[PDB]
Each structure stands twice: as structure tokens, then as C-alpha cells.
């Protein structure tokens, strides 16, 4: 019979998707396959009927000993939390057996999506953050910020303070209150503005939904690593002044015309100026942080192979634990 | 609760998806919205790890009084029937509420896909075939050919003979035998070659999987309508010599470099030479067949709005009849 496994968010959590390790492990493998160019990843088509209101199709194939195909079909409505009391992002991931191309799994996407994006920060930090760093900064208190924080805390037990800013001060206060209770020994500090938050972080993670940059280069401590997960938060000067700029995929960043492409089109950046793709750091191909004064920027577009790899890892754990609903295709 | 309806192929059939009318009705509306440019349809990204071995993401939004978003994620392995005794094509359609962008349905795609492609031929024939035509030609005896035939027979009761060719003579014989039993009064004729089949058809439908053209212009009877569903079957001269060429979407056909784009890039065709987009015939914007000697070619790329419209029609019928499996997203 042609069957598929359906995994809702509860099943995904039950199968290990509520903690970072599975994502770190999945993405380490996927980033390795990426550095060996053993994947295929078409440009993501956006469906706009805000730069946030859209549904994005993210297909990819990851080659290798355990190859997998699939697509993340993920949408957002800026309005959902405020007007409808629903999460902003929603979606499904479909997995496909590359032997037959048949769909084999239908899974909830939003948890997986935000967890894999947090694992991006984790893996980058393992390579690019100062060793033993004590101060973490989160900008933006949504579900992205929440998974970013959860994952950093799981992966780096030396974090002692967390600086937190959201321009909706209310969202900030609720976020700090819950986390302060979740982790009583860690000092969570709600800051009065983004500058205060950024200025204090040895690792800074941007998790907002604006498209105007506010982060200025001189807010950055010497030795800082900034994981610019929400893309548009960082002023252009930062790209020009950081000692190292890392991306997930050069060809994606250099599409017309994202911030890096605009920099290239004037005479201000080039593939030559780029320190690394992330996968290249994973493989030990190119060094990561080399001293403790370097200010280092990661600017990831976000890649389908990350979603499909993660979802696939979780699917196998679910199958092993008899989790999920078996559906018939026919 | 965030819930979705899962409809497998059996449910889709139970909900009316096993007959043409629902597709004709869905596509008439979608083609109307297309002619009024009330849709958004990104270029389809192909995932190739044969021109047939791939998975295609087909996202679209159809505006209008009952707007709907969604994606068809549909794959093929040339090999599946021969090596694995599985259907070549497989896939899922996901539907999305454009209010929130949340997914609302997960449905089996392959039946819907082939049925909507047959409805394309039906609707085009209503506008472009000679009225009362008696002779139908099917080239290719797969599931595409099968749905094309089923739908023409349902929609045109004046068909008296069906000329059938498949280059795998065995596939042809099995197809004719089953259909001869299904419809005993109609003469099904297995032909010795494609030329014999094409030469006899007042309506000719191409349903093969080759990428080399064999159909020559002078095989075509005066007054013929050819629905070139499998795209590559028709020699270039046909595009140049037909009295009318109709497409589903000009911008899609003129992408670099399909047959029509190659014609445009040399000096041999232009948007000026094109008689119509299909939607324009539906709206009564541009006349269809104007006399009974005209030889008329339809060359459809295939469009996401057709899949999503059809799936949406079927979803509503399913909801009304309590068909399908309710899934939780969370």
C-alpha cells in the first residue's frame, strides 16, 4: 500500500522535536552535504496575494547515504497574532522517497522551521562565538526568539545573563517573566532599547519582523558574534566593518537584490570578501573564530535542506516509536 | 483548533472527483479569474536529483469571491510502472485559507492532476473542436490518456469512434480492450502507428512521455483540433502552419526556452501570432473555432490555479458530505 505518516506538532515533540539536539545533528549532516554540493535546492518561490505576508515553497533534495527529498510549504500573516490570536507562521513539510518520488510523510512545519533556524545559530556559535561566552542577547520575543533562546541555553551551559529587547515592551516583559521562572539562576534583563541589549551581548541574535535596519556597527562589543536570523536588522556598515562575514549559501544571498547583492553591485563586497559558507566551517574546510577581538556576522538566507533534513531525522525517530497517524494515499 | 481535512484518492472519488463535471466547473471559474488576471502564480520550481524524473512545486492563489491558496507537489519517476509496478506520477495538494495563510487540506494529487488536464481538453474542445465531431484520437495509453478519454466521452456524446495508439502496442491493446467493454457501441480502433491514429481524429489528444516530436502538420485533417497535452509531441511546423494556436498562459510558454520561445527567438512566432489564451475563449473575449476547415492547436503548459481550483471545489463537496479524515495541526 502507498502510505504516509502524518506528524502533527504534538507527535513531532513526542518524537524529540521539542529539543535542539536532533536539529543540531540533522543540520550538521545537511551542512556537510551542502559543503560537498550533494543537494539540489531550487530558488524558493514566494506566493504574495507586508514582506511578511506570503506563503513560501521551499523544495530540496539532500543526497548521501540516506538521501531524502521534500518541500516546506510555510506561510505567514503579520496579522494572525494581533487580529486573530493565532501564530504568525504556519505550514506543512512533505517528505518524498527519492527512489519513487512518492510522498512519505506530511508534518507540521512551524516548530521544525523555528527549531532548525535556532540550530543554525547554535552550530554557527560553536564555530564563531567566543568560547565560554557568558552574555546572550535576544532581540524579538516571538516564537523565533523563544526557540533561539531555548536552543542556546540547551547547547551552551556557560550562559549567565540574557539581554532581551522587543519593541513591544509588553511582549518583552511576558517573555522575560516566563524564562526567568524556567531558568531561575540565569539573569534575564529586559532592556530599555535595542542599543542597550545589543551593546551587552557576546552573542547577539536578531529575531524580529521589521525590514528596516537599526543595529549599528559600534553597538557591537569587540569579540561579538551576531547571528542575524531576521536578516534586515543589521545596518550595511556592519557587513563592511565586521572582521568576518559568514553566510549559509552565497548564491542565495547574492540574489537580486538582497542586502549583500546591493553591496556587491556597488563596489563594496564580493565573494572574495566573504569569510565562509557555514557548511565550510562544519567540515573544517575554513577556520571559524581565530581570536577574541574579531567581530563576526552570520547572515543566513535560510535553506530547504535544513527543514527537510530535520523533518527526516524526526520522521525516523517517530517511525521507531510508533508515533503519528498512518494515512493511505489511495 | 487548527484542523485540516485529509482526502485520499478514495475520498476524492467519493466526493465527485471521479467524474469530469466538477473539474470543468472549477476550471471554467479559474480560467475566468485568469483572464481577469485575478490570481498569482509563481514560476514552478522543478526538483531534479529523464525530463520526466522530477518533483514539481506548483504554488498559486486564485482571487475572487471565493479566493483560495495552495500548492501542488507532484512527482514522477519514468521507472515506477516498469520497475516497481507503481504509478509514474504521485503527489499531494495542500490548500490554504488566504485569510491566515494556514493550511486547511492535504489531498492526494495525481487523480486531480490528470482530471484537471482532461478538463483543459474538454473546455478547449467546446471552443475549438468542430461541433458534433465523431472521431477522437488518443495517443498514449497511460493514466493521462485514460482520464482524457473518460472526460471526452462524458462531455461529448456524439463521439462514435476512438482511434488509439501507444508505441508500447501491449499498453494499447489492454487500453482498447477495457474501454471497448466500458463503451460497447463506440468503435475503439487500435492503430498500427501514430500517423494512422492522428490522420483519423477530428480531435487529437497527445498523452505520451517522449520529448521528441513526431506529429507532422500534414497528418492533420482539415478541421482538426489538437490538444497537445504532452507538449513535445508536435513538430514545430505545426505551430507555424496551424490556423490558430491557443495556449493557457503566454508568459509560461515563452519561458527560456520551450518550443514557443525558440520559435519567438528566431523570427517565426510572436504574441502577435497567438490567437488566444484559453481563459480569453472562456470569457467570450476572443472567438474560438470560426469555420470547419481551420486546423487548431492548443499548447498548454499546465497551471497551478487549475489544480488548486479543482481541489478546492472537491474539498467543499467533501466537507458537505462529511468525507475525509480530520487532522489536528498541533
XYZ file of C-alpha atoms in Angstrom:
660
model
C 0.000 0.000 0.000
C 1.081 3.586 -0.547
C 1.032 5.023 2.940
C 2.249 8.180 4.548
C 2.921 9.164 8.106
C 1.198 12.266 9.400
C 3.003 14.006 12.271
C 1.325 16.903 13.960
C 3.226 19.263 16.320
C 2.445 17.086 19.351
C 3.824 13.989 17.604
C 6.900 15.957 16.429
C 7.534 16.978 20.057
C 6.875 13.419 21.264
C 9.459 12.221 18.699
C 12.229 14.573 20.009
C 11.371 17.694 18.023
C 10.952 19.763 21.228
C 14.716 19.829 21.888
C 17.725 21.132 19.925
C 19.983 18.064 19.690
C 18.002 16.404 16.881
C 18.219 19.644 14.852
C 21.918 20.151 15.553
C 22.569 16.567 14.410
C 20.352 16.847 11.309
C 21.849 20.194 10.234
C 25.458 19.105 10.843
C 24.844 16.338 8.288
C 22.947 18.583 5.893
C 25.579 21.340 6.074
C 28.250 18.721 5.412
C 26.305 17.535 2.325
C 25.907 21.217 1.357
C 29.701 21.838 1.535
C 30.138 18.783 -0.725
C 27.431 20.176 -3.031
C 25.438 16.912 -2.638
C 21.971 18.501 -2.650
C 19.690 20.309 -5.080
C 17.829 23.361 -3.923
C 15.783 25.426 -6.396
C 15.073 29.103 -5.749
C 12.151 29.426 -3.304
C 9.032 30.778 -4.986
C 7.096 33.247 -2.809
C 3.295 33.451 -3.034
C 2.187 37.051 -2.237
C -1.564 37.694 -2.734
C 3.816 43.089 4.279
C 7.067 41.452 3.210
C 5.900 39.023 5.916
C 2.507 38.184 4.310
C 3.261 35.318 1.924
C 3.473 31.537 1.504
C 6.869 30.129 0.529
C 7.562 26.859 -1.257
C 10.975 25.501 -0.257
C 11.810 22.313 -2.141
C 15.104 20.404 -1.791
C 16.877 17.055 -2.146
C 19.687 16.046 0.169
C 21.904 13.365 -1.334
C 24.100 10.969 0.588
C 23.913 7.550 2.191
C 20.405 8.456 3.391
C 19.090 10.763 0.663
C 15.718 12.423 1.046
C 13.535 14.788 -0.921
C 10.757 17.088 0.266
C 9.300 20.603 0.420
C 8.479 23.059 3.212
C 5.289 24.994 2.461
C 5.263 27.674 5.013
C 3.222 30.829 5.353
C 2.884 33.934 7.456
C 0.282 36.600 8.166
C 1.747 39.554 10.135
C -1.787 39.963 11.427
C -2.502 36.482 12.895
C -1.288 37.046 16.466
C -2.723 40.601 16.819
C -6.085 40.238 14.991
C -6.791 36.503 15.339
C -4.865 35.165 18.321
C -3.104 32.648 16.037
C 0.556 32.091 15.395
C 2.031 34.196 12.607
C 3.784 31.312 10.797
C 2.141 28.043 9.801
C 2.868 25.241 7.358
C 3.499 21.678 6.333
C 6.600 19.757 5.312
C 6.072 16.841 2.890
C 8.851 14.237 2.623
C 9.477 12.133 -0.505
C 11.324 8.854 -1.128
C 13.849 9.763 -3.842
C 13.576 6.193 -5.266
C 9.992 6.619 -6.484
C 9.489 10.302 -5.725
C 6.355 9.277 -3.675
C 5.356 11.398 -0.669
C 6.073 9.501 2.559
C 5.273 11.984 5.360
C 3.084 15.041 5.973
C 4.297 17.029 9.008
C 3.522 20.290 10.786
C 6.241 22.775 9.764
C 6.355 25.743 12.068
C 8.020 24.166 15.094
C 10.560 22.362 12.889
C 11.212 25.609 10.989
C 11.953 27.707 14.087
C 13.943 24.904 15.749
C 16.150 24.419 12.671
C 16.785 28.190 12.496
C 17.843 28.090 16.168
C 20.202 25.153 15.368
C 21.740 27.338 12.654
C 22.661 29.818 15.444
C 23.917 27.006 17.691
C 26.198 25.491 15.049
C 27.467 28.902 13.921
C 28.124 29.856 17.571
C 30.120 26.643 18.158
C 32.411 27.916 15.371
C 32.183 31.687 15.617
C 31.315 32.754 19.224
C 33.991 33.294 21.880
C 34.492 30.072 23.860
C 32.775 30.184 27.264
C 30.703 33.310 26.454
C 28.502 34.483 29.366
C 26.191 37.139 27.813
C 23.478 36.330 25.247
C 21.260 38.908 23.540
C 17.841 38.136 22.041
C 16.067 40.856 20.007
C 12.412 39.954 19.409
C 10.231 37.919 21.749
C 8.140 35.877 19.338
C 8.338 32.168 18.687
C 11.589 32.611 16.744
C 13.233 34.423 19.702
C 11.794 31.753 22.035
C 13.320 28.800 20.117
C 16.585 30.671 19.618
C 16.813 31.200 23.388
C 15.724 27.656 24.311
C 18.316 26.143 21.963
C 21.229 28.371 23.030
C 20.508 27.583 26.676
C 20.374 23.831 25.938
C 23.635 23.969 23.972
C 25.750 26.441 25.967
C 25.625 25.949 29.780
C 28.073 28.782 30.441
C 25.471 31.435 29.567
C 24.904 33.501 32.712
C 22.936 36.515 31.513
C 20.386 37.041 28.740
C 19.698 40.581 27.495
C 16.231 40.862 25.962
C 14.528 43.553 23.899
C 11.304 43.685 21.997
C 9.934 46.952 20.661
C 6.577 45.817 22.022
C 7.664 46.206 25.674
C 4.718 44.070 26.753
C 5.929 41.086 24.673
C 9.374 41.579 26.232
C 8.016 41.529 29.845
C 5.969 38.333 29.340
C 8.948 36.619 27.653
C 11.384 37.581 30.431
C 8.914 36.612 33.191
C 8.334 33.081 31.804
C 12.033 32.455 31.112
C 13.101 33.854 34.476
C 10.882 31.179 36.048
C 12.105 28.500 33.626
C 15.747 29.278 34.475
C 15.975 30.996 37.924
C 19.823 31.135 38.197
C 20.223 32.972 34.866
C 19.708 36.744 34.997
C 17.247 37.791 32.301
C 17.404 41.528 31.756
C 14.660 43.434 29.917
C 16.422 46.377 28.260
C 15.027 49.866 27.561
C 16.064 49.874 23.909
C 17.743 47.670 21.304
C 21.041 49.529 21.694
C 21.351 48.545 25.374
C 20.541 44.910 24.505
C 22.979 44.646 21.540
C 25.794 46.515 23.416
C 25.790 43.889 26.174
C 25.717 40.612 24.172
C 28.743 38.461 23.404
C 26.322 36.592 21.141
C 23.539 38.688 19.568
C 20.585 37.002 17.778
C 18.040 39.026 15.775
C 14.529 37.584 15.787
C 12.303 40.494 14.687
C 9.913 41.099 11.764
C 10.853 44.621 10.605
C 12.592 45.297 7.316
C 14.463 48.420 8.437
C 17.981 48.038 9.930
C 18.747 49.567 13.341
C 21.784 47.585 14.523
C 24.826 49.844 14.203
C 28.422 48.597 13.984
C 29.637 50.472 17.035
C 26.982 48.866 19.297
C 28.953 45.701 18.837
C 31.350 44.628 21.567
C 34.763 43.537 20.452
C 34.609 39.758 20.253
C 30.875 39.673 19.437
C 29.169 37.121 17.255
C 25.954 38.254 15.706
C 23.539 35.720 14.268
C 21.355 37.832 12.059
C 18.475 35.379 11.793
C 15.833 38.021 10.816
C 18.077 39.424 8.023
C 17.121 43.103 7.740
C 18.006 44.145 11.312
C 21.648 44.904 10.604
C 22.903 48.138 9.000
C 25.009 47.776 5.822
C 28.122 49.159 7.553
C 28.185 46.011 9.725
C 28.736 43.841 6.625
C 31.553 46.197 5.631
C 33.136 46.540 9.084
C 32.826 43.036 10.602
C 36.097 41.144 10.547
C 34.258 38.087 9.173
C 31.003 37.639 7.321
C 29.584 34.108 7.082
C 26.539 33.056 5.108
C 24.684 29.794 4.653
C 24.679 29.966 0.849
C 26.467 32.563 -1.277
C 24.320 32.200 -4.424
C 21.120 32.706 -2.370
C 22.440 35.871 -0.600
C 23.643 37.302 -3.877
C 20.174 37.120 -5.477
C 18.779 40.392 -6.840
C 18.732 42.346 -4.770
C 19.169 41.388 -1.122
C 21.475 43.439 1.140
C 24.610 41.518 0.089
C 23.727 41.747 -3.601
C 23.300 45.513 -3.265
C 26.723 45.623 -1.646
C 28.231 43.565 -4.493
C 26.541 45.676 -7.223
C 28.203 48.788 -5.823
C 31.890 48.075 -5.201
C 31.637 47.185 -1.517
C 31.569 43.393 -1.125
C 32.386 40.340 -3.259
C 32.617 36.563 -2.863
C 36.307 37.401 -2.212
C 35.350 39.422 0.911
C 33.178 36.584 2.315
C 34.937 34.548 5.015
C 32.941 31.327 4.656
C 29.807 29.461 3.956
C 28.566 27.804 7.171
C 28.956 24.257 5.783
C 32.631 25.029 5.163
C 33.097 25.747 8.870
C 31.315 22.483 9.752
C 33.669 20.412 7.533
C 36.771 22.075 8.992
C 37.436 23.407 5.490
C 37.846 27.021 6.674
C 38.656 28.229 10.225
C 35.994 29.848 12.433
C 36.725 32.478 15.090
C 40.536 32.977 15.212
C 40.827 35.495 18.092
C 38.658 37.039 20.759
C 38.527 40.584 19.355
C 37.079 39.592 15.960
C 33.543 40.867 15.432
C 31.784 38.175 13.358
C 28.465 38.386 11.432
C 26.404 35.405 10.241
C 23.775 36.335 7.596
C 21.764 33.162 6.698
C 19.110 33.209 3.981
C 17.566 30.027 5.371
C 17.717 26.807 3.326
C 15.245 23.994 2.485
C 17.800 21.260 3.100
C 17.756 22.273 6.802
C 13.988 21.747 7.065
C 13.922 18.504 5.107
C 16.932 17.103 6.952
C 15.424 17.910 10.351
C 11.966 16.612 9.393
C 13.546 13.438 8.069
C 15.510 12.831 11.299
C 12.252 13.276 13.266
C 10.253 11.065 10.893
C 12.678 8.177 11.509
C 12.506 8.661 15.302
C 8.673 8.730 15.035
C 8.639 5.517 12.979
C 10.874 3.848 15.588
C 8.492 4.858 18.419
C 5.234 4.180 16.583
C 4.233 7.839 16.787
C 1.894 9.501 14.332
C -1.105 8.707 12.144
C -0.736 6.347 9.219
C -2.622 7.673 6.187
C -3.414 5.890 2.919
C -2.553 7.759 -0.275
C -5.199 5.967 -2.370
C -8.467 24.224 16.946
C -6.299 24.325 13.844
C -7.565 21.396 11.834
C -7.094 20.154 8.331
C -9.010 17.759 6.168
C -7.092 14.878 4.656
C -8.583 13.493 1.433
C -7.067 10.414 -0.075
C -7.880 9.288 -3.655
C -10.850 7.208 -2.476
C -12.327 10.193 -0.618
C -11.668 12.466 -3.637
C -13.587 9.986 -5.823
C -16.340 9.673 -3.198
C -16.610 13.496 -3.231
C -17.144 13.682 -7.052
C -13.516 13.705 -8.175
C -14.038 10.568 -10.324
C -16.057 12.484 -12.944
C -15.295 15.461 -15.216
C -18.094 17.914 -14.373
C -16.513 19.120 -11.114
C -13.252 19.828 -12.991
C -14.985 21.551 -15.899
C -16.839 23.771 -13.406
C -13.730 24.503 -11.306
C -11.562 25.316 -14.345
C -14.219 27.485 -16.024
C -14.104 29.686 -12.908
C -10.325 29.577 -12.627
C -9.824 30.375 -16.325
C -12.247 33.277 -15.942
C -10.203 34.574 -12.966
C -7.062 34.006 -15.078
C -8.433 36.135 -17.976
C -9.148 38.875 -15.405
C -5.616 38.418 -14.024
C -7.083 37.756 -10.533
C -4.546 35.111 -9.477
C -0.856 34.901 -8.628
C 1.176 32.044 -9.977
C 4.956 31.945 -9.450
C 7.207 30.019 -11.828
C 7.142 26.306 -10.919
C 10.433 25.148 -9.430
C 11.480 21.670 -10.608
C 13.411 19.344 -8.285
C 15.693 17.077 -10.400
C 18.055 14.858 -8.344
C 14.721 11.785 -17.654
C 12.932 15.080 -18.225
C 10.175 13.055 -16.526
C 12.135 12.269 -13.312
C 11.483 15.250 -11.040
C 9.237 16.723 -8.336
C 7.471 19.982 -9.192
C 6.208 22.604 -6.765
C 3.217 24.441 -8.239
C 2.005 27.201 -5.932
C -0.874 29.580 -6.747
C -3.566 31.887 -5.361
C -6.903 32.298 -7.084
C -8.634 35.530 -6.127
C -12.342 36.211 -6.352
C -15.461 35.877 -4.242
C -14.110 32.523 -3.021
C -10.334 33.008 -3.055
C -8.043 30.122 -2.225
C -4.333 29.490 -1.973
C -2.400 26.231 -2.210
C 0.386 24.225 -3.857
C 0.549 21.022 -5.910
C 3.654 18.990 -5.064
C 3.765 16.407 -7.711
C 6.459 13.992 -8.783
C 7.262 11.415 -11.409
C 9.653 8.511 -11.882
C 9.657 7.224 -15.501
C 10.644 3.923 -13.933
C 7.800 3.365 -11.406
C 5.372 1.423 -13.613
C 8.048 -0.722 -15.360
C 10.440 -1.460 -12.443
C 8.139 -1.139 -9.414
C 4.556 -1.682 -10.535
C 3.623 1.775 -9.180
C 2.075 4.729 -10.911
C 4.542 7.099 -12.549
C 3.078 10.310 -11.063
C 2.334 10.870 -7.387
C 1.770 13.858 -5.127
C -0.136 15.973 -2.671
C -2.072 19.217 -2.958
C -2.173 21.417 0.172
C -4.883 24.100 0.361
C -4.523 27.323 2.381
C -7.032 29.851 3.748
C -5.836 33.166 2.284
C -7.100 34.992 5.433
C -4.492 33.458 7.746
C -2.397 31.582 5.200
C -2.982 28.386 7.326
C -3.091 25.007 5.564
C -6.660 23.667 5.539
C -6.495 20.463 3.450
C -3.972 17.785 2.463
C -5.150 15.837 -0.612
C -3.851 13.170 -2.978
C -2.802 14.962 -6.187
C -2.411 12.567 -9.058
C -6.061 11.891 -9.855
C -6.929 15.594 -9.529
C -3.933 16.486 -11.723
C -4.875 14.160 -14.595
C -8.589 15.007 -14.323
C -7.914 18.763 -14.479
C -5.668 18.261 -17.538
C -8.518 16.328 -19.200
C -10.920 19.217 -18.351
C -8.476 21.550 -20.108
C -9.057 19.456 -23.280
C -12.826 19.417 -22.706
C -13.118 23.188 -22.295
C -10.777 23.875 -25.222
C -12.762 21.413 -27.380
C -16.061 23.148 -26.505
C -14.483 26.267 -28.062
C -12.127 24.911 -30.698
C -13.347 21.473 -31.959
C -15.851 21.129 -34.809
C -19.384 20.911 -33.385
C -20.716 17.336 -33.365
C -17.300 15.736 -34.064
C -17.432 11.916 -34.357
C -13.742 10.825 -34.353
C -11.451 11.154 -31.312
C -7.754 10.255 -31.266
C -5.807 9.357 -28.113
C -2.007 8.937 -28.356
C -0.609 7.276 -25.222
C -2.440 4.758 -23.058
C -1.308 5.711 -19.571
C -3.355 7.322 -16.844
C -3.261 10.676 -18.656
C -4.691 9.106 -21.854
C -7.248 7.242 -19.701
C -8.588 10.404 -17.991
C -8.501 12.338 -21.256
C -10.648 9.632 -22.872
C -13.023 9.244 -19.905
C -13.637 13.002 -19.778
C -14.157 13.489 -23.531
C -16.654 10.625 -23.565
C -18.529 12.097 -20.571
C -18.620 15.558 -22.165
C -19.224 14.800 -25.856
C -21.897 12.117 -26.528
C -21.572 12.432 -30.303
C -18.186 10.668 -30.308
C -18.607 7.481 -32.344
C -15.062 6.257 -32.916
C -11.857 6.473 -30.878
C -8.505 5.957 -32.624
C -5.842 4.763 -30.188
C -2.072 4.418 -30.446
C 0.623 3.686 -27.950
C 4.156 2.874 -29.042
C 4.034 0.060 -26.497
C 1.497 -1.973 -28.522
C 0.735 -4.048 -25.436
C -0.387 -0.962 -23.457
C -2.561 -0.013 -26.442
C -4.286 -3.463 -26.593
C -5.118 -3.533 -22.857
C -6.448 0.053 -23.022
C -8.653 -0.648 -26.058
C -9.941 -3.944 -24.599
C -11.069 -2.351 -21.294
C -12.646 0.683 -22.985
C -14.346 -1.433 -25.640
C -16.083 -3.248 -22.769
C -16.798 0.007 -20.918
C -18.427 1.514 -24.027
C -19.610 -1.288 -26.404
C -21.373 0.940 -29.018
C -18.265 3.084 -29.625
C -15.711 1.627 -32.046
C -12.261 1.702 -30.461
C -9.595 1.170 -33.086
C -6.013 0.213 -32.187
C -3.852 1.724 -34.936
C -0.569 0.378 -36.355
C 1.295 3.661 -35.960
C 0.800 7.210 -34.685
C 0.303 8.531 -38.221
C -2.790 6.356 -38.776
C -4.212 7.457 -35.400
C -3.569 11.219 -35.895
C -4.789 11.160 -39.562
C -8.212 9.896 -38.472
C -9.009 12.186 -35.493
C -11.220 15.262 -35.640
C -9.926 15.850 -32.111
C -6.377 14.626 -31.400
C -5.033 14.483 -27.802
C -1.360 13.740 -27.064
C -0.758 11.880 -23.811
C 2.771 10.449 -24.174
C 6.051 10.854 -22.250
C 8.627 11.323 -25.038
C 10.381 14.611 -25.672
C 10.853 14.148 -29.423
C 8.129 15.431 -31.806
C 6.614 13.052 -34.377
C 3.273 14.689 -35.218
C 3.592 16.245 -38.672
C 1.365 19.044 -39.989
C 0.102 17.116 -42.988
C -1.197 14.234 -40.810
C -3.791 16.692 -39.650
C -7.251 16.559 -41.187
C -8.732 19.841 -42.240
C -10.957 20.921 -39.371
C -8.865 19.142 -36.711
C -8.372 20.317 -33.167
C -5.264 19.063 -31.498
C -4.921 19.245 -27.734
C -1.219 18.856 -27.229
C -1.363 17.877 -23.568
C 2.099 16.165 -23.510
C 3.784 19.222 -25.129
C 6.733 17.806 -27.085
C 4.753 15.521 -29.427
C 4.097 18.151 -32.072
C 6.633 19.219 -34.724
C 7.494 22.948 -34.877
C 5.923 23.317 -38.341
C 2.508 22.660 -36.748
C 2.841 25.833 -34.642
C 3.748 27.703 -37.828
C 1.091 26.142 -40.076
C -1.975 25.814 -37.803
C -4.578 28.464 -38.498
C -4.861 29.113 -34.741
C -2.555 28.483 -31.823
C -4.043 28.714 -28.320
C -2.138 28.473 -25.066
C -3.127 28.507 -21.418
C -0.608 31.189 -20.437
C 1.619 33.147 -22.818
C 4.314 34.133 -20.287
C 4.735 30.473 -19.221
C 5.063 29.179 -22.841
C 7.527 31.910 -23.681
C 9.937 30.890 -20.893
C 13.501 30.080 -21.966
C 13.462 28.028 -23.938
C 10.350 25.950 -24.583
C 9.224 25.238 -28.170
C 7.292 28.525 -28.470
C 10.159 30.548 -27.007
C 12.542 29.001 -29.539
C 10.093 29.997 -32.252
C 9.920 33.570 -30.904
C 13.736 33.872 -30.561
C 14.115 33.077 -34.252
C 11.656 35.183 -36.254
C 8.866 32.620 -36.521
C 6.222 33.334 -33.868
C 5.264 36.226 -31.574
C 2.497 37.124 -29.123
C 1.009 38.787 -32.249
C 0.744 35.378 -33.999
C -1.012 33.759 -30.992
C -4.790 33.502 -31.425
C -5.752 33.366 -27.745
C -5.136 32.375 -24.218
C -7.688 29.727 -23.174
C -9.249 31.945 -20.472
C -9.966 34.530 -23.172
C -12.056 31.968 -25.057
C -13.924 31.089 -21.840
C -14.872 34.756 -21.199
C -16.086 35.237 -24.779
C -13.307 37.812 -25.142
C -11.924 36.234 -28.340
C -13.752 33.871 -30.749
C -12.952 30.139 -30.866
C -13.270 27.978 -33.987
C -14.691 30.191 -36.792
C -15.029 27.619 -39.618
C -14.783 23.892 -40.127
C -11.570 23.846 -42.183
C -9.424 25.630 -39.572
C -6.732 23.398 -38.097
C -6.374 24.500 -34.451
C -3.571 23.703 -31.944
C -3.825 24.056 -28.154
C -0.409 24.020 -26.393
C -0.992 24.248 -22.581
C 1.915 24.488 -20.149
C -0.326 23.374 -17.290
C -1.157 25.822 -14.480
C -1.346 25.616 -10.653
C -4.599 27.558 -10.484
C -6.274 24.593 -12.255
C -5.133 22.138 -9.569
C -5.939 24.391 -6.631
C -9.317 25.374 -8.064
C -10.293 21.748 -8.674
C -9.008 20.580 -5.276
C -10.889 23.411 -3.613
C -14.179 22.514 -5.355
C -13.717 18.895 -4.182
C -12.757 19.927 -0.643
C -16.053 21.827 -0.282
C -18.068 18.860 -1.619
C -16.182 16.581 0.834
C -16.922 18.916 3.759
C -20.616 18.930 2.788
C -20.721 15.096 2.750
C -18.571 14.516 5.830
C -15.923 12.727 3.777
C -12.285 12.539 4.774
C -10.101 12.409 7.875
C -9.920 15.393 10.184
C -6.330 16.001 11.302
C -5.057 18.329 14.031
C -2.216 20.662 13.068
C -0.882 20.965 16.636
